[PDB]
Amino acid sequence: WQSGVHTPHGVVYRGAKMKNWPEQRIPENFKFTEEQRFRTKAIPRDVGTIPRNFVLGVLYRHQPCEVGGLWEHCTNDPEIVLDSKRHLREVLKQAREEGFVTFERDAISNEWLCFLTRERYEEVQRIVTAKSEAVDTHSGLRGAAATETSTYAEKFREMNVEAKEAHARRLEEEVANTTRYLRRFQQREIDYLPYTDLNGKVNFMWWYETRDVQ
């Protein structure tokens, strides 16, 4: 997508950029003709394992997820793999069809809140734990600072024993700052290739890498 045409100028999504897609400026005077805008299409987005796992992890973190709240949490999270709100909606639809997410009109507020199916909650927990363990084992630098790890464990225990809402909010702010600082240099690129399965349905194979803009 392009910021200047698909969205009002000045709107940018801090997600995962597509590989080789050029961010090209568009004049402010640009505007579609209504028939062309109706006839316009959209590139299919990834609805598979990694995006659904990321969305399920975001919901697992913030069990009550409003629309804007969910988008902001996804943007804040450093494991962003999505590309745009359209990709987020497609992933949410796929999860709903699989039977993971449930949407309810909250009594307190008209906004549609989101919950996770209890039957799939165990699966979500297993996915989250497996991802955390895999990241911990893969991170080579992690564990080099035994004192730092011990202090972090002490902080975890302190938060558990005390009220950890303020600690969680401060950690979310720090995570947002760190994600911005990371985005300043690195970026998660997405590279896709179309293919045709035996059934005759065109699908896309995707892979995500990390590139250092520097």
Partner: protein, 82 residues
């Protein structure tokens, strides 16, 4: 009359019934194992096709082939025809 265990005398009807039972069991077993073999063949063929697709994707990535027409990534970025 007699107090021995109930034993059915061997008769053409009884032997025909046993033959029919064995034939039915044989047909059932043959079809079941045929279905199992076909399932294994389909599973391995799907696995091979997935491996083929992975190899094709790796080769296309190496060669810079996007398989999305002569146009560059700008058209896909526009997303006005995808």
């Amino acid at each position: 009359e007699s107090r021995h265990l109930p034993v059915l005398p061997m008769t053409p009807r009884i032997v025909f019934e046993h033959a029919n039972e064995k034939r039915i069991d044989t047909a059932k077993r043959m079809r079941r194992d045929r279905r199992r073999i076909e399932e294994l063949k389909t599973l391995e063929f799907w696995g091979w096709y997935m491996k083929l697709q992975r190899v094709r994707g790796r080769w296309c990535r190496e060669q810079g082939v996007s398989s999305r027409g002569v146009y560059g990534p700008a058209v896909d970025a526009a997303e006005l025809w995808g």
